[PDB]
């Protein structure tokens, strides 16, 4: 298996391709880059992402489902307010306890681990830049 087993909902929306200045702000953020290890240890087989800056900043969401879609979508588990309406910006796919980010937008330029990435293998401590706001991916509950 490889694809999301079920039905991804097709979306029609108009996305503007960003030519943004936020890359300068990313550079202003250059200082320390959090690094964590132990993602493959799997605390409870789950992982969470905390909004460090953004509309929902301060909230942490946990990925408990095998497929987590992010962006504006009626069925997106991770709802983030974009600058435009991103019907499909990124999805986090959980396969055998491993987390992969697949960017299905590249519209703003998805940065995963602070770098533009179309497909990413997630690690704890990974920083995801969605628009001009950022999410920090952390290992989930160790309950």
Swiss-Prot record:
Domain of life of the organism encoding this protein: Bacteria
Residues with PTM Phosphothreonine: 14
Statement: the UniProt record of this protein carries the keyword Manganese: no
Coiled coil ranges: none
Keywords from the UniProt entry: Cytoplasm, Phosphoprotein
Domain (FHA): residue spans on this chain: 68-117
InterPro entries linked to this entry: Cell_Proc_Reg/RNA_Proc (IPR050923), FHA_dom (IPR000253), OxygluDhInhib_OdhI (IPR048204), SMAD_FHA_dom_sf (IPR008984)
SMART domains linked: FHA
Cellular component GO terms, alphabetical: cytoplasm
UniProt subcellular location: Cytoplasm
Summary of the function given for this chain in its UniProt record: An essential component of the PknG signaling pathway. When unphosphorylated, it inhibits the activity of 2-oxoglutarate dehydrogenase. When phosphorylated it does not inhibit 2-oxoglutarate dehydrogenase.
Record-given protein name: Oxoglutarate dehydrogenase inhibitor
Source organism of this protein record: Corynebacterium glutamicum (strain ATCC 13032 / DSM 20300 / JCM 1318 / BCRC 11384 / CCUG 27702 / LMG 3730 / NBRC 12168 / NCIMB 10025 / NRRL B-2784 / 534)
